[PDB]
Amino acid sequence: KIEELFKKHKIVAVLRANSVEEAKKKALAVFLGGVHLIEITFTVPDADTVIKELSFLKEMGAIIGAGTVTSVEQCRKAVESGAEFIVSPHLDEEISQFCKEKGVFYMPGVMTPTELVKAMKLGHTILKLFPGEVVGPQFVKAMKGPFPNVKFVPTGGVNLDNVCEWFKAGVLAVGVGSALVKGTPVEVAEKAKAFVEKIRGC
């Protein structure tokens, strides 16, 4: 299901912005450019309102989730406002449990083998790898040995020059923030197109 969406789309826009209006415009830009998985981070002011106001894009096939979720209270608001998936930078046992009871897909972030194993023990096999620019594809390749059945979605520094290396290392999808989302709506929509083509291209 959610696994299958990540597998199909291969890219999630990690949307940080200074306002509701900027966040919505960038989410539309990205969608118009072919990115269907959209993660509204909780560093966006009133991130819940943004998720609720983008709810209609679901009817056009957009998949709207929440990122930078750091407490169960934030998790509740996101789900209440229609988030189809929850992402955090870290592994949160409390958010894991809440999302399990609520029946919503949670992708915790991990940076070490010990964190990875704890996440697996909590039932997760699709992991956010964060920050990707610190560990790199090297980390993803290293994990294939001992943990052949874990799959990563790196966030952090993924860009046009390295996106194909990441996929060569064995990642399931990539989460792209500033390389995709920074700039004006027009620039973002265009960069969205470039990433889709570059990803298809490899």
Residue numbers in the entry: 0 to 201
Please give me the paper's original passages concerning this structure.
Here, we describe interactions of the hepatitis A virus (HAV) capsid with components of host endosomal sorting complexes required for transport (ESCRT) that play an essential role in release. We show release of quasi-enveloped virus (eHAV) in exosome-like vesicles requires a conserved export signal located within the 8 kDa C-terminal VP1 pX extension that functions in a manner analogous to late domains of canonical enveloped viruses. In this report, we show that pX contains crucial determinants of quasi-envelopment, acting as an adaptor that recruits ESCRT to the viral capsid by binding two distinct Bro1-domain proteins, ALIX and HD-PTP.
Thus, to assess the role of pX in eHAV release, we fused the pX sequence to the C-terminus of a 203 amino acid de novo designed protein that self-assembles into a 60-copy, 25 nm wire cage dodecahedron. A 6.7 Å 3D structure of these nanocages determined by cryo-electron microscopy was very similar to that reported previously. Cryo-electron microscopy of purified EPN-pX nanocages showed no clearly discernable density for pX. The pX domain appears suitably positioned to interact with the Bro1 proteins and other ESCRT components identified in the proteomics study. Fusing pX to a self-assembling engineered protein nanocage (EPN-pX) resulted in its ESCRT-dependent release in extracellular vesicles.
